[PDB]
């Protein structure tokens, strides 16, 4: 009874970071050997658990959160980080107990002329609670004057496209990120 991990890491497309996908894993036999013993993962960083010790423990739920970000924004996927992704798109709790796996996916998610299917939130009145997301597309209100739904000054659209291109530098090249949280 193997785990759906094949349908997460080897998924066709990943959700945008502002609407990151979450999948629940339970009542399953998890094989973390296939993950750690794979060179495809540029970033494989675990907090609170050891990658080799992972197979020796059992948890009641494993949450796999999948999304796509930039290379420079991978650092923000860590407990106690500040940035666009951490503050407005995906916030991890400080007491994080889980792993983060990010690998470069330029030859999947970057396309000629810009990939505009991937978006991230630019603004929000308050930072996100950990493991909380909002898919709201309402026109961000930056100042006092009511927007009334007219984009313009202090009425900014909250979502911006990454515009992934295959000729970008490694920093801006897309990275697919899967966050495993154990409870």
């Amino acid at each position, epitope marked *: 009874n193997l785990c759906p991990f094949g349908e997460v890491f080897n998924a066709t497309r990943f959700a945008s970071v502002y609407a990151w996908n979450r999948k629940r894993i339970s009542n399953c036999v998890a094989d973390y050997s296939v993950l750690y013993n794979s060179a495809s993962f540029s970033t494989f960083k675990c907090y609170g658990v050891s990658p080799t010790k992972l197979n020796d423990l059992c948890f009641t739920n494993v949450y796999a959160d999948s999304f796509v970000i930039r290379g420079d924004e991978v650092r923000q996927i860590a407990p106690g980080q500040t940035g*666009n992704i951490a503050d407005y798109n995906y916030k991890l709790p400080d007491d994080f107990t889980g792993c983060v796996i990010a690998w470069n996916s330029n030859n999947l998610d970057s396309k000629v002329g810009g990939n505009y299917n991937y978006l991230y939130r*630019l*603004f*929000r*009145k308050s930072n996100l609670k950990p493991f909380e997301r909002d898919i709201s597309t309402e026109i961000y209100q*930056a*100042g*006092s*004057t*009511p927007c*009334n739904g*007219v984009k*313009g*000054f*202090n009425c*900014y*659209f909250p979502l*911006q496209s990454y515009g992934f291109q295959p000729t970008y530098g490694v920093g801006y090249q897309p990275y697919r990120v899967v966050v495993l949280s154990f409870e």
Partner: antibody
Amino acid sequence: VQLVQSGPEVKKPGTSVRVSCKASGFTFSTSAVQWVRQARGQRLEWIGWIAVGSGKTDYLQKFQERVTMTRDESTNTAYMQLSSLRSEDTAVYYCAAPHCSGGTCYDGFDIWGQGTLVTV
Amino acid sequence: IVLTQSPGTLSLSPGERATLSCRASQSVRSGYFAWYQQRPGRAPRLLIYGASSRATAIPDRFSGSGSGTDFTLTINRLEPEDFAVYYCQQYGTSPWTFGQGTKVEIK
């Protein structure tokens, strides 16, 4: 909070000027930078504006093809690239940005950089 | 929108009220109209917002009332310190347009 422009960029006709405004104190990710122009002894002439967050630039139709505007958010600045300079563009250029500290902009373009005199 | 400033040039003395009436062609989107003061050499400084809400650090001698097309700026104790060119602006969905400046003149 403050905003300082480039220096004078006296050039020859047909050249291109890259005027830079550098901002301090803001949460510049939410700010907007409008670019305006004023000849000597004349009235202000709007050029365009930049939404720094989305990086979305709106130009005046007269300047639509000639001029472009960019941000480079890493350095918290704002750049105006003006193409071939006709003799009319002998004017002082100004940036304007609002109090956008703490992810909440303050209505009105209060903060203004000292102008840069560009001669054609 | 093509704005204008009716009073032209103010040939006043630093004792009486200065009225700066600004008239647009269309209306403006809510409180997006704004007033600016530009001293003869200085960069313009922002005074007023949509209707009356003055900017921070603006001395109380500066006030203004107006909505829709019509707008007005009032100066009660006109001062030698207050002798500049005052500009209109609108932040509407149209390309934002200033107004022809009004110079306040002494005596």
